[PDB]
Amino acid sequence: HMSICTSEEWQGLMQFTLPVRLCKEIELFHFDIGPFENMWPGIFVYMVHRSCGTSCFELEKLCRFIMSVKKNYRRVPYHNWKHAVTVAHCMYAILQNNHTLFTDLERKGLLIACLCHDLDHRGFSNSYLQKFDHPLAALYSTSTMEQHHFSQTVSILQLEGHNIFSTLSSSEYEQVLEIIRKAIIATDLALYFGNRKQLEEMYQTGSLNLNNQSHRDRVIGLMMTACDLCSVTKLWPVTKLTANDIYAEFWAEGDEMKKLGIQPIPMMDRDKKDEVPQGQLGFYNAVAIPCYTTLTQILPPTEPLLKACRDNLSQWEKVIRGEE
Ligand SMILES: Cc1cc(C)n2nc(CCc3cc(O)n4nc5ncccc5c4n3)nc2n1
Ligand SMILES: [Mg+2]
Ligand SMILES: [Zn+2]
């Protein structure tokens, strides 16, 4: 039930090389992949290589994986291929700026995790799918979509010639899959609020321990969340744009509720469009800022992410105040 790439597709990727003028900028947290669609798969390979060295995966195998992952992203407005690469890039930039805090295994796991994190997203919320009553809510019922995403990845990994993790020992294979699973579940925004509070706590008492596996899992989780939302960390015109994409999805969901005579909450209501900039401010304040704030505390190199968020926040304020 999975989808495979064609030989055409994967072999062209083997051949790709990144333009030198992009090399500098790929390393910046605010870097925007948006102009270079074309090169997106290429960019991930680069990033894998620059992160994990040029023979961490058998090149032929890596390309097959990436290009198939691409195939199993739907053509929805926001949770699409582009989202996946954007999130993967942000993790790349976190990983590079904290290089020795994380194991080889972790960096492979996470870059792959981010690339895979919203596989086969239909554009409908976890709420919806349960709240009236999709066959996927019938299979898992806490963090529905995520357990699906993780499943998808695994299905993709277990494809013929697709297993990039093969030449690890079955210990290390069975370990990265754990890293990938927890990191993908982490992306369920529901879970984030708990995780942040604990991490808030632990840092503040001075009991957070990177040698403790469970603390480790949590920081990673926060990292995942920080990457998931990073559109809120790009320069203003980029971010403005992305917002349109996230709303396009929500509103389409709201239409499907309206079609069954059910009032959607205001967020997925295209008839409540002016309330949007006020929607954002709220989101930055309750979710975004807190997210990045705690990640900069734990991981001080991740500070620019926080800085960019603040700058976007004030743009939104100015919109609400009528100055845009
Ligand atoms: C990149 C990104 C990622 C995620 C998960 N989100 N989630 C949001 C929703 C923000 C929000 C919350 C809310 O309660 N309302 N109410 C509203 N009424 C009207 C208009 C917008 C509203 C709104 N908007 N924006 C995101 N951007
Ligand atoms: Mg998700
Ligand atoms: Zn996501």
UniProtKB/Swiss-Prot annotation:
PDEase domain mapped to chain residues: 6-323
Disulfide-linked positions: none
Catalytic center residues: H79
Locations listed in the record: Cytoplasm, Cytosol
Residues annotated as binding a divalent metal cation 2: D118
Tissues where this protein is expressed: Abundant in the putamen and caudate nucleus regions of brain and testis, moderately expressed in the thyroid gland, pituitary gland, thalamus and cerebellum.
Residues annotated to bind 3',5'-cyclic GMP: H79, Q280
Chain positions recorded as 3',5'-cyclic AMP binding sites: H79, Q280
Phenotype upon changing D118N: Reduces activity 1000-fold
Binding-site residues, a divalent metal cation 1: H83, H117, D118, D228
Associated pathology: Dyskinesia, limb and orofacial, infantile-onset: An autosomal recessive, early-onset hyperkinetic movement disorder characterized by axial hypotonia, dyskinesia of the limbs and trunk, orofacial dyskinesia, drooling, and dysarthria. The severity of the hyperkinesis is variable.
Function text: Plays a role in signal transduction by regulating the intracellular concentration of cyclic nucleotides. Can hydrolyze both cAMP and cGMP, but has higher affinity for cAMP and is more efficient with cAMP as substrate. May play a critical role in regulating cAMP and cGMP levels in the striatum, a region of the brain that contributes to the control of movement and cognition.
Recorded domain comment: The tandem GAF domains bind cAMP, and regulate enzyme activity. The binding of cAMP stimulates enzyme activity. Composed of a C-terminal catalytic domain containing two divalent metal sites and an N-terminal regulatory domain which contains one cyclic nucleotide-binding region.
Homology family: Belongs to the cyclic nucleotide phosphodiesterase family.
SUBUNIT field: Homodimer.
Name the record gives this protein: cAMP and cAMP-inhibited cGMP 3',5'-cyclic phosphodiesterase 10A
Species this protein is from: Homo sapiens
Location of this fragment in the whole protein: 715 to 1036 of 1055
